[PDB]
Amino acid sequence: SCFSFRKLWAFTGPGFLMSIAYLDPGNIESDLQSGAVAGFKLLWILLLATLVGLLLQRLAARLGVVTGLHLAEVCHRQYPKVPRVILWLMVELAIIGSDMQEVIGSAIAINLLSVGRIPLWGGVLITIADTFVFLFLDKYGLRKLEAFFGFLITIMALTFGYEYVTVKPSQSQVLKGMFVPSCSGCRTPQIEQAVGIVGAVIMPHNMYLHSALVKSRQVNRNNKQEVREANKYFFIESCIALFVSFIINVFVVSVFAEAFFGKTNEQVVEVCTNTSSPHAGLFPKDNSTLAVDIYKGGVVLGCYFGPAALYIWAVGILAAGQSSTMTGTYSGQFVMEGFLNLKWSRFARVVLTRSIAIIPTLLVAVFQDVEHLTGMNDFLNVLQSLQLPFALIPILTFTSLRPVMSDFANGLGWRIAGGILVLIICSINMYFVVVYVRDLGHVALYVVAAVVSVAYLGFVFYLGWQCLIAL
Ligand SMILES: [Mn+2]
């Protein structure tokens, strides 16, 4: 048949987890910074990042279907023993960074629900209970969790939808920002946050997860018709999931763009004092523009539109953090199953990720303040943008070789588009790393920074050289 919902319902199950995977708290933070630094003018790059992320997720589905072994397994079989462990360690660092960003977001939301009675370290300690939830799930062995993901999308959609309905932003301006590429009056940190959003939307570890979830569906690899049908339907399912995630991201960008774009500190301080909520001394009184965090965004939202919008924003961040936790556990489990061949349970993986996440975050929370936590969040964002090439390259390298894919290699346009995509991404990363290095200027710590930079560039050059051999 050409297309039918009867066959569409059979292939369901990867779609919900892929949909929640694109709305971790880091994605909401990237949209949050997008909606105050630049407003609507830098919304089209969200659509571009979502479109190229799907067009990469379909390659993940193709690698999953045509050969039953998912992306971590074929990565184990293809590359040698030396770079396999290094690429695995960089993927682990990316997953740990995502889980640490989750811990920051969940700690901020736990602090913000309770009206500040719970300290930040209290929220970071309260985030440990996800591990005990995973213990109870393994013990009882539900092993389905689709209803969770559906309820998660339900609560997140109704939260940010209530935010959008309350603020009532202009659809003409948001569509103008959406479909007309134009960034007038640009400034170099504005393009820095542009690279931040394009690096944060394409999460690095989603491929491995999508390939493994596609592998979970039984399918005859030899038969061509079932292969093509399952491949195209997983592509449509990923398209629907990414469309829903893109709509929620657009809601976040539009609400923060219309509400607090360009509002100086005096206006928000006067309005929030008129509201009489106790959270007023956080913002200074000076001519500068409003700086928004996951916390400070919630405070300005509460002081503008009452406590209901604040609690809805915080519970939305909590649901997004739960999504990032579950996606991190699943992707990490398949990564350890494939790369170095350890059949670790979900509980051991969540203990590893959550412990390495909470130790620096508990230190920073119990010592330093919320502004340094958001600075660490920005550091994790630029880290995720740094880790983007290790997801862009190897999938393109593996699902184009004729021996591994049989007759389902990529066509000429797909390969050349991937070539220009890898070239623009690694050139952006090289320029951004030297931009970050030139500020440093130290006698010695400049040297170890240069050592890290040249090591990373050598590894990215090796992967790109392997890809150009493959293409
Ligand atoms: Mn992330």
Side-chain angles (χ1 to χ4, degrees), residues 345-358:
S345 55
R346 300 184 292 191
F347 164 72
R349 164 55 82 161
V350 86
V351 184
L352 182 63
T353 56
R354 191 51 45 100
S355 301
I356 305 178
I358 66 156

Side-chain angles (χ1 to χ4, degrees), residues 319-359:
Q322 206 65 221
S323 149
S324 199
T325 292
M326 231 89 72
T327 285
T329 72
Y330 267 88
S331 95
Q333 189 184 26
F334 296 127
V335 159
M336 245 184 279
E337 167 159 59
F339 269 92
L340 44 84
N341 201 327
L342 261 177
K343 196 188 299 320
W344 271 26
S345 55
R346 300 184 292 191
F347 164 72
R349 164 55 82 161
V350 86
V351 184
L352 182 63
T353 56
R354 191 51 45 100
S355 301
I356 305 178
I358 66 156
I359 284 288

Side-chain angles (χ1 to χ4, degrees), residues 132-143:
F132 292 0
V133 167
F134 267 99
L135 210 63
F136 285 12
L137 290 148
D138 258 5
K139 273 192 174 182
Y140 293 10
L142 282 302
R143 220 73 58 77

Side-chain angles (χ1 to χ4, degrees), residues 32-33 52 74 83 88 96 158 201 212 223 254 270 282-283 312 327 373 379 391 396 400 402 414 437:
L32 176 56
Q33 299 277 60
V52 83
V74 72
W88 165 78
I96 287 156
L158 278 327
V201 169
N223 191 5
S254 147
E270 190 256 33
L282 297 55
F283 298 143
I312 262 57
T327 285
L373 269 177
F379 174 45
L396 188 45
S400 301
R402 227 150 284 286
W414 284 110
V437 163

Side-chain angles (χ1 to χ4, degrees), residues 62-382:
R62 286 176 94 269
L63 183 47
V65 161
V66 152
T67 167
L69 330 170
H70 64 265
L71 179 50
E73 289 204 28
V74 72
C75 192
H76 166 46
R77 281 147 47 81
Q78 286 298 332
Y79 288 154
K81 190 159 212 306
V82 153
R84 173 172 68 83
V85 177
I86 318 179
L87 184 58
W88 165 78
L89 238 187
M90 294 322 308
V91 165
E92 291 278 26
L93 211 84
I95 280 168
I96 287 156
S98 173
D99 213 317
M100 199 172 21
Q101 232 189 325
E102 188 299 313
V103 168
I104 301 160
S106 182
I108 284 160
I110 286 286
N111 162 263
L112 190 47
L113 271 284
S114 161
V115 201
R117 311 152 187 254
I118 285 163
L120 288 175
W121 59 266
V124 171
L125 290 176
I126 284 280
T127 39
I128 290 154
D130 230 320
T131 297
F132 292 0
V133 167
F134 267 99
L135 210 63
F136 285 12
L137 290 148
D138 258 5
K139 273 192 174 182
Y140 293 10
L142 282 302
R143 220 73 58 77
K144 193 197 295 181
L145 272 193
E146 165 280 6
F148 210 118
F149 310 145
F151 164 72
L152 205 151
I153 286 291
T154 299
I155 186 157
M156 253 161 54
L158 278 327
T159 49
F160 301 132
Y162 168 53
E163 294 288 83
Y164 197 92
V165 176
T166 32
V167 161
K168 298 179 176 58
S170 56
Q171 61 174 353
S172 173
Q173 197 150 315
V174 83
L175 286 205
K176 171 62 177 186
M178 197 93 110
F179 298 146
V180 176
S182 65
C183 187
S184 58
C186 66
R187 165 216 71 186
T188 309
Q190 196 171 136
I191 307 85
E192 188 167 353
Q193 152 273 289
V195 153
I197 185 190
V198 86
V201 169
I202 313 181
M203 303 267 306
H205 62 267
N206 286 352
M207 326 323 199
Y208 309 127
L209 174 56
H210 198 220
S211 56
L213 291 172
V214 165
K215 164 181 183 179
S216 70
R217 164 60 177 204
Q218 271 72 10
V219 63
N220 199 324
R221 296 151 53 191
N222 300 90
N223 191 5
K224 191 166 290 307
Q225 261 69 266
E226 297 167 20
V227 155
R228 174 150 50 257
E229 190 178 13
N231 174 32
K232 94 174 281 180
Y233 274 32
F234 286 135
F235 162 69
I236 297 208
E237 213 165 81
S238 63
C239 168
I240 277 164
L242 267 294
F243 171 73
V244 170
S245 89
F246 171 72
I247 287 288
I248 291 165
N249 278 321
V250 163
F251 285 8
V252 171
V253 174
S254 147
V255 71
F256 261 85
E258 195 272 357
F260 332 115
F261 174 44
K263 282 188 167 60
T264 176
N265 279 262
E266 272 71 74
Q267 299 170 284
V268 54
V269 164
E270 190 256 33
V271 166
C272 172
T273 293
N274 222 62
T275 297
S276 324
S277 151
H279 286 135
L282 297 55
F283 298 143
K285 265 192 297 305
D286 289 345
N287 221 289
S288 62
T289 45
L290 188 62
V292 289
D293 319 325
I294 298 166
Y295 183 28
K296 269 173 220 205
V299 200
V300 63
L301 261 182
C303 261
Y304 265 81
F305 314 124
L310 171 41
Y311 300 155
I312 262 57
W313 173 258
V315 88
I317 275 284
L318 276 188
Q322 206 65 221
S323 149
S324 199
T325 292
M326 231 89 72
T327 285
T329 72
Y330 267 88
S331 95
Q333 189 184 26
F334 296 127
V335 159
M336 245 184 279
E337 167 159 59
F339 269 92
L340 44 84
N341 201 327
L342 261 177
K343 196 188 299 320
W344 271 26
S345 55
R346 300 184 292 191
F347 164 72
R349 164 55 82 161
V350 86
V351 184
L352 182 63
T353 56
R354 191 51 45 100
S355 301
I356 305 178
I358 66 156
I359 284 288
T361 299
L362 189 73
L363 258 290
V364 169
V366 74
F367 284 13
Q368 292 175 25
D369 52 11
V370 294
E371 285 78 8
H372 284 248
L373 269 177
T374 312
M376 177 152 111
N377 200 319
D378 159 270
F379 174 45
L380 308 212
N381 209 88
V382 87

